[PDB]
Design a protein around this ligand. Structure first.
Ligand code: BEF
Ligand SMILES: [Mg+2]
Lengths: 15, 128
């Protein structure tokens, strides 16, 4: 995962 | 703004601890100590005063995921912010770190701006 993919992932987890 | 927030920087790679310490210094945080793995980190943390952890994943002796779980389970430090900064970038692992209570997650290689952005975001979530 790129940082943008990480951010999208964590946003979907409620961060 | 509170610039005395004391950071523990955990990474088995000396260059990376140096990078993170220098970046924190730029942001105005001079109260920074280092550890090389989770066992070293837990020893440092019993000296008190630590308000923030930035941690690698892959480390000998105790890895960052074990460290994070240990911190989350300790009443002496359960809600202590932990930012993961790691080469580990598999979706499953990022999800696992998050579920284990990681406060945020930065994949290596990262820019100064990314670190500042992720730290700021954690501060905001917590009212810091
Ligand atoms: F060794 Be760390 F996970 F980059
Ligand atoms: Mg490592």
């Amino acid at each position: 995962a790129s940082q943008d993919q990480v951010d999208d992932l964590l946003d979907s987890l409620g961060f | 703004a509170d610039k005395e927030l004391k950071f523990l920087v955990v990474d088995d790679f000396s260059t990376m601890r140096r990078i993170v310490r220098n970046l924190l210094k730029e942001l105005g945080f001079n109260n920074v100590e280092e550890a090389e793995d989770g066992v070293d980190a837990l020893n440092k943390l019993q000296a008190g005063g630590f308000g923030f952890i930035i941690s690698d994943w892959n480390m000998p002796n105790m890895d960052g995921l074990e460290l994070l779980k240990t911190i989350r389970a300790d009443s002496a430090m359960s809600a202590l912010p932990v930012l993961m900064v790691t080469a580990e970038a598999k979706k499953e692992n990022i999800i696992a770190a998050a579920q284990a209570g990681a406060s945020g997650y930065v994949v290596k290689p990262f820019t100064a701006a990314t670190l500042e952005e992720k730290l700021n975001k954690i501060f905001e979530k917590l009212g810091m």
